[PDB]
Design a protein around this motif. Structure first.
Motif, mmCIF file in Angstrom:
data_model
loop_
_atom_site.group_PDB
_atom_site.id
_atom_site.type_symbol
_atom_site.label_atom_id
_atom_site.label_comp_id
_atom_site.label_asym_id
_atom_site.label_seq_id
_atom_site.Cartn_x
_atom_site.Cartn_y
_atom_site.Cartn_z
ATOM 1 N N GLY A 223 -10.633 4.021 -2.840
ATOM 2 C CA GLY A 223 -9.774 3.784 -1.701
ATOM 3 C C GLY A 223 -8.311 3.937 -2.068
ATOM 4 N N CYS A 224 -7.455 3.721 -1.073
ATOM 5 C CA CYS A 224 -6.016 3.836 -1.262
ATOM 6 C C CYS A 224 -5.289 2.500 -1.186
ATOM 7 N N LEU A 225 -6.005 1.393 -1.010
ATOM 8 C CA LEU A 225 -5.396 0.084 -0.814
ATOM 9 C C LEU A 225 -5.767 -0.851 -1.956
ATOM 10 N N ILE A 226 -4.804 -1.661 -2.378
ATOM 11 C CA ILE A 226 -5.080 -2.702 -3.375
ATOM 12 C C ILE A 226 -6.034 -3.727 -2.770
ATOM 13 N N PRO A 227 -7.113 -4.091 -3.455
ATOM 14 C CA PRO A 227 -8.050 -5.067 -2.890
ATOM 15 C C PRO A 227 -7.430 -6.451 -2.764
ATOM 16 N N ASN A 228 -7.894 -7.184 -1.748
ATOM 17 C CA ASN A 228 -7.598 -8.609 -1.580
ATOM 18 C C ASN A 228 -6.097 -8.885 -1.523
ATOM 19 N N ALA A 235 2.509 -9.701 5.699
ATOM 20 C CA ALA A 235 3.867 -10.194 5.500
ATOM 21 C C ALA A 235 4.839 -9.049 5.245
ATOM 22 N N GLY A 236 4.403 -8.033 4.494
ATOM 23 C CA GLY A 236 5.273 -6.904 4.204
ATOM 24 C C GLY A 236 5.657 -6.111 5.437
ATOM 25 N N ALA A 237 4.745 -6.007 6.405
ATOM 26 C CA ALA A 237 5.058 -5.284 7.632
ATOM 27 C C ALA A 237 6.186 -5.962 8.400
ATOM 28 N N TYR A 238 6.166 -7.295 8.478
ATOM 29 C CA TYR A 238 7.266 -7.989 9.142
ATOM 30 C C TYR A 238 8.568 -7.814 8.372
ATOM 31 N N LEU A 239 8.496 -7.847 7.039
ATOM 32 C CA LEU A 239 9.689 -7.654 6.224
ATOM 33 C C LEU A 239 10.320 -6.298 6.506
ATOM 34 N N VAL A 240 9.496 -5.249 6.570
ATOM 35 C CA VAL A 240 10.007 -3.925 6.908
ATOM 36 C C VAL A 240 10.586 -3.926 8.314
ATOM 37 N N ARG A 316 2.827 3.243 5.956
ATOM 38 C CA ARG A 316 1.591 4.027 5.912
ATOM 39 C C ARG A 316 0.384 3.156 6.269
ATOM 40 N N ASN A 317 0.424 2.636 7.493
ATOM 41 C CA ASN A 317 -0.688 1.853 8.014
ATOM 42 C C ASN A 317 -1.935 2.725 8.085
ATOM 43 N N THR A 318 -3.035 2.232 7.519
ATOM 44 C CA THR A 318 -4.302 2.948 7.540
ATOM 45 C C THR A 318 -5.248 2.445 8.621
ATOM 46 N N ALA A 344 -1.928 -1.958 5.133
ATOM 47 C CA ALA A 344 -0.808 -1.053 4.932
ATOM 48 C C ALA A 344 -0.362 -1.105 3.469
ATOM 49 N N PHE A 345 0.750 -0.433 3.187
ATOM 50 C CA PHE A 345 1.289 -0.300 1.838
ATOM 51 C C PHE A 345 0.251 0.213 0.834
ATOM 52 N N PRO A 346 -0.330 1.388 1.072
ATOM 53 C CA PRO A 346 -1.282 1.931 0.100
ATOM 54 C C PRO A 346 -0.578 2.356 -1.180
#
Ligand SMILES: [N]C1=N[C]=NC2=C1N=[C]N2[C]1O[C]([C]OP(=O)(=O)OP(=O)(=O)[C]P(=O)(=O)O[C]2[C]([O])[C]([O])[C]([O])[C]([O])[C]2[O])[C]([O])[C]1[O]
Length: 446
Positions: A223-228, A235-240, A316-318, A344-346
């Motif tokens: 996959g392209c996303l860090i697990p867990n 939280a990162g999406a709101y920060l952005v 980069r929302n998946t 997000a954040f892959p």
């Protein structure tokens, strides 16, 4: 749960804790899933959404990946009856004929069902047959003898898939392989019906021929996303959002909560403020077909839509469908809420067999060029490298909170995000549309 910089959010968390003390616990949004809860205040009013936080490579493992494992008869790409690890039974459409052939191969009456050991036994025989086909062929054996073991496996893979005669037809590619012209053979092998019919597998086999390595088979399914780490993504999406003043993500922070309704002691997770009166975007898109928006509200909706595009592209929302961005419609007359931002954040851009597209890109609105309003509001930020660096540092402070934080993996996330910001910057300067923005080939900033 100290929020010194945000007293308003802290009071909301205090209300959440007070409700828990009086027995008002968060409830699962869906009874089946234990990863999402509606948090209520002492007046039982929903205030937030809480989301708690040696392999050996050879021809056999190569073909297991390429062919899979089914213990019951199934149809293949062409619809031919197949079982086990890519074992063709017959070209006949008769299922009884396939069961007849299967029974002969197994040595008992299977009625179309075999065991894993029997599947492996057929698999070993089929691989040996493929090797026999190679060695008994005047055009395959000289190529086979001249190849290293890894590239020999790729040759065995092709003979397994399409048979000795089919592989023997690649007259020029076989000669290039024998002459060790890997790049020329790889290019020539792609111009084949075999590639077009099964492009993902042929690309793996060709890469094995080109490199003589197992790299096409090593990191499959990662996959392209860090697990867990979905809570950090929320939280990162709101920060952005906050740093760009998009104001479409409800305030989301990493919080700790303890509740008897949790599945087990405080649990960490993301806490996103509940928004009221919003419907799914797909709902309002459907309604606007009969009652199209007045031009003043259409422009307001489009600017909100552009903010959503900017947020999703940058992070980069998946996992953005048209059901998990919400729209309120009756200051803002029409408003967008970007919720459910946990995927997000892959750390890498996706491969093209699993594209993870933004589902708002299908919409007709996505073809509307970015407004001069949004371009003048956003370009000063994203074009400022000091701003981009500060954003990455802000995300670092947030993302390093997790135990499984890895500096190299994080810098991969930022390289993807910086690459997204670069493409978005150019797209806004070019006056492109969200639909055109997602067509730009993905780039990274190393
Ligand atoms: N801020 C907000 N304000 C107001 N309303 C909000 C809101 N935020 C959300 N809502 C509403 O609450 C619903 C669910 O919020 P949500 O984020 O979708 O949570 P969710 O757990 O991911 C769901 P799920 O069925 O996909 O759960 C699956 C599992 O079952 C499993 O299969 C796996 O796939 C995953 O573990 C998991 O995704 C949304 O539709 C909205 O109506």
């Amino acid at each position: 749960n100290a929020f010194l910089d945000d007293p308003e959010f802290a009071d909301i968390m205090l209300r959440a804790e007070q409700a828990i003390e009086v027995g008002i616990f968060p409830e699962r949004i869906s009874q089946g899933s234990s990863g999402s809860y509606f948090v209520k205040d002492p007046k039982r009013k929903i205030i937030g959404v809480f989301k708690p936080k040696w392999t050996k490579y050879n021809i056999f493992e190569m073909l297991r990946i390429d062919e899979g494992l089914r213990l019951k008869i199934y149809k293949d790409t062409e619809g031919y009856y197949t079982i086990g690890i890519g074992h063709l039974l017959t070209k006949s459409p008769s299922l009884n004929a396939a069961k007849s052939e299967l029974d002969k191969a197994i040595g008992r009456n299977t009625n179309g069902v075999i065991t894993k050991d029997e599947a492996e036994k057929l698999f070993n025989q089929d691989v040996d047959a493929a090797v026999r086909g190679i060695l008994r062929n005047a055009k395959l054996k000289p190529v086979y003898d001249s190849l290293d073991a890894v590239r020999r496996a790729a040759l065995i893979n092709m003979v397994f898939q399409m048979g000795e005669t089919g592989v023997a037809g690649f007259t020029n590619s076989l000669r290039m392989l024998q002459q060790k012209r890997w790049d020329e053979a790889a290019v020539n092998l792609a111009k084949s019906r075999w590639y077009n019919q099964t492009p993902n597998r042929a690309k793996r086999v060709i890469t094995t021929f080109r490199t003589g390595t197992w790299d096409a088979y090593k990191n499959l399914g990662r996959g392209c996303l860090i697990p867990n780490q979905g809570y950090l993504s929320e939280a990162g999406a709101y920060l952005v959002d906050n740093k760009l003043h998009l104001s479409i993500v409800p305030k989301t922070k990493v919080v700790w909560l303890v509740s008897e309704t949790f599945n087990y002691p405080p649990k960490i997770g993301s806490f996103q403020l509940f928004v009221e009166g919003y419907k799914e975007a797909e709902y309002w898109l459907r309604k606007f077909e009969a009652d199209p928006l007045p031009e003043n509200i259409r422009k307001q909706f489009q600017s909100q839509f552009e903010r959503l595009v900017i947020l999703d592209y940058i992070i980069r929302n998946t996992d953005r469908g048209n059901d998990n961005w919400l729209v309120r419609y009756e200051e803002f007359l029409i408003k967008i809420a970007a919720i459910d931002n946990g995927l997000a954040f892959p750390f890498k851009h996706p491969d093209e067999w699993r594209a993870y597209p933004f589902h708002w890109a299908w919409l007709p609105q996505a073809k509307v060029p970015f407004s001069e309003e949004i371009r003048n509001l956003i370009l000063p930020y994203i074009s400022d490298m000091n701003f981009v660096q500060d954003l990455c540092e802000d995300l670092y402070e947030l993302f390093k909170t997790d135990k499984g934080f890895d500096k190299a993996t994080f810098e991969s996330q930022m390289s993807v995000m910086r690459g997204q910001i670069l493409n978005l910057t150019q797209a806004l300067r070019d006056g492109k549309s969200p639909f055109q923005l997602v067509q730009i080939p993905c780039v990274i900033v190393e």
